Amino acid sequence: EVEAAISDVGGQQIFSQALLNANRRGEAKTALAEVQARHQELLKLEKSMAELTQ
């Protein structure tokens, strides 16, 4: 007559992935992309003070 055939229900697991804040944007965001123009200024101090020391 009868027996077993399909059984369980209460039993499962799940992993979990993750995205990230957008503002993050490219690494260049404050104190990163400005270092290009901040360097020309610093080269200006170096120079103007080279005039100073000479």
């Binding site: 901040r38 200024e41 101090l45 103007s48 003070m49 100073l52």
Partner: peptide, 19 residues
């Protein structure tokens, strides 16, 4: 704003010391 102030101060000392 700090780096600009430093630059201005250095320029002024350069002027004083050319004189």
């Amino acid at each position: 704003s700090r780096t600009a102030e430093l630059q201005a101060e250095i320029d002024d000392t350069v002027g004083i010391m050319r004189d």
